[PDB]
Amino acid sequence: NKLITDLSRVFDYRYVDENEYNFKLISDMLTDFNFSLEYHRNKEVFAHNGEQIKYEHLNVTSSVSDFLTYLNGRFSNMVLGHNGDGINEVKDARVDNTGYDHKTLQDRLYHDYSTLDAFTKKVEKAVDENYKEYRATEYRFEPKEQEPEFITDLSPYTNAVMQSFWVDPRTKIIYMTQARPGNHYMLSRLKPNGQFIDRLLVKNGGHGTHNAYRYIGNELWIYSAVLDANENNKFVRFQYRTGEITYGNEMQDVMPNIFNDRYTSAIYNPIENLMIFRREYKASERQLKNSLNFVEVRSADDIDKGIDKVLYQMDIPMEYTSDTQPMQGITYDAGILYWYTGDSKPANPNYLQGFDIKTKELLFKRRIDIGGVNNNFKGDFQEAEGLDMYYDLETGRKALLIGVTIGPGNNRHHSIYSIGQRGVNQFLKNIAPQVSMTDSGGRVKPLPIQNPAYLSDITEVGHYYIYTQDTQNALDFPLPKAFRDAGWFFDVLPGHYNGALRQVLTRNSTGRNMLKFERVIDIFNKKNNGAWNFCPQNAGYWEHIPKSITKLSDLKIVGLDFYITTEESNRFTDFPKDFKGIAGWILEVKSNTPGNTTQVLRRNNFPSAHQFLVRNFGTGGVGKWSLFEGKVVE
Template structure:
């Protein structure tokens, strides 16, 4: 006997209706949505973010002169990651640094992938609250190997590191650039004669299963690849060389369902206010499709401009309406890099950490040459004009005007302070030891020589303070003036002091005068060079 329901629907029809509704939750890509409404909502957004107007988002504050290769947001937009590559040794594989930054581009920490390649394209994966990256590393035999690793600040990984999860079924080509989009992973492979993007299930790759869902052949005129990202059925491809000299700068969109390109836009933004790129340099670098938990999307595009020593790592975005408001809120917290017009209002980044980050081999002065205001600075070990060049340090900068101001630092032992004045000739004056906490004693410090005066007989002119007594030592050859040096404020006598000085092996004497303004004047009296060894009481 047939069962009838209201509106005369029999049981068999009712079951078929349920099945039909269930099947309708599956979209054309095989994704099962929780509700039919979710599927329809998702398809309504399929117009592509490229239809949105492009807008400037931020400039990533990387170490001076560095060019980003790619960048990646976490889903909650709490962190932004950026990659910088360096060729450290001739004949060796490149090394890339993965920086973790605030969402507006201020450095928090980093990890180094030593000899692991250029880091051109990585895939970011969030798993149980942890951030993982996928990359390719050299195998030492042929091609590249696909790897996965957890982001860990302040560590160095090598291609052989046990912390790298290795997937050997997916390598053996020149590159294996990965991109992750929800449950899928895109592996973009390059051989000498082709580029192919393969779409696979992420779970298959993790289990070692070598199965391609669909693939796209990239046209030869787009081989100068600068960034890859993916969104459901779409693959976005950024291409073009510096200033578009050989190949134009383009964003191309392909569909896995057809294997064809359906949209292509010129990258015609990124220049300065005058209509030209800063330093006459412009290159696309990095592409990332961001999607939050609501499904709101943004396509971020990297554009680098500026001279070799002053790169501007700019980020632009095609936002959905929801994300435009979201990232505008984040952008409002941004602190401009090297502001030239406005007075700096904050001494730290929006996250409370340092405002500027100076990398080993770079200079503090170069970072601050266009800066005005207060700022905190973090220096890596090896910064060329750092007071603690063998260790990291933090510095407070107080710049009254461009090229005029001072810097204060406490060293890694938490016991010494330094100060330095920025000069307009592109350098810092020598760092001076101000005091030791709890005592007036200082270590030996090099005397700042002036007017062409220089050391004689390999004995460097130096000074130090022991209690209230100033000690000088070393030898000096006269320059263009009798004024051979200057002492810092904390090491000057209360009254002018005159002392005899002698030459090497000579009975002749000259006269050294140390003034209350710190000036050291030597009357050489016919001597070419003199010893300045002496000790004076600063308080008499």
């Protein structure tokens, strides 16, 4: 009787029949609705109630049922309504409903209706004022004031100052552009909390102080200011992907004959579907215009097709684009252009200045202490960064948000603040939580993959636990397949600003030693990941060699304890032939050149004399066991 919007996910006869029945039902329901409307319009008796239909005289609105009842009442009154003394009736009607006798009936009626109209208009003005006050308190957006609110913190894998910062309202993902040591730049795409996801290295891009991010349809295009190998700036359109990208046929340009003269970079606003380009001025007309940059607006459709249509043009004076306060950010909203500038030190205070584009004026400018409170930043580096306008598709509430860096030296911080309205900052924080060693209640966190192959796949910092069955695969494990029997508390710790991360793995076992290993990994170049260091971490418990009793040469790991009973010792090959099966033995390992390693073996005899024999095996050779015997004394 109704549609099936829950389609089968296996593509069988059920799915095909659902689709076919769906189209059949749509056709049937539509022709039924058409026939129903036609019946309504032609033959349906009492289709409408008489109260509905409107009878519009001059400047007057009323139904038909009310009007007809009024006509009938008029007739009834004129016929069977008693009458007489009309002059006295009028002269008595001259009085009003408070006790004041007017001079004439028309003047009385006028006064009464004017009183009512004035009272109603006063009520209406009060209502409009109350509504406007409610709106201005609810949808308040006054970046003249409205002290900012922290939003989140960014964790890109790059040791450079961030230079632009956009948020995607359709998927709640951040795109963060830093300028690498060379000319080239890189944009990292990452999670709402800050967890890195992937990156794209725009080779031979500029400083890339801001790109534009557009949704022509269900897909995200990126407009940027990329200069070819001949140092010719170009306004170029492309798509996101993971890895590297150079200027070429992989990234097409929108309008070369218009946007290749000067360094131009755009930002897009989807509310009104516009695009403002911050085009630079050449050194020739530089002093003539007294402005390093000028902004020009264009509609999205005009810039998509072949028409310029500069709607609004403005220049940026040196008062705003000075060296002590250089450009760091641009944003457009409701014809109000926002310019964010800030020096690379907290001595020269930053400034956000908003002003109307249509009139080319200065609406406002404010100082804002973003990042460390009380101007007490991490060291002294308040290098500012741009800002944009997040428009949630659910509520429709715009929200300005700004990026800042407060980190000293190579160590860069990446903090985000916002001047949004009510209901946007809360939502942006509550999308997803920040990272933490434990999830929220003091439990271990989950792996991203079960039975992982490379332990370097786990990039997200925090603690984890590898079950004994999940450890079995573990292509890069400190131990071999034969030694692992139990689980491992495995925790990833932050490395440095490139793609590094520390790892630690501590065995889980109460009835034996909880040995731990430690290392470093590099997520990008998996080959650059260190080896498995080891800490002793003993408790007095003992470890036995498993059925891999082929040779003692496989036990290259450093500083372990391995018991060897008589029965155990009567299997090994490297074990000497004189002490085979005479008593128990404790094995220990000591470091050396790679491949090479020393193995000490100590007898376990209480009454008899003690013995210990040492070997060195590996690259240098097999090694000969040298003995040392003790003198029983008391």
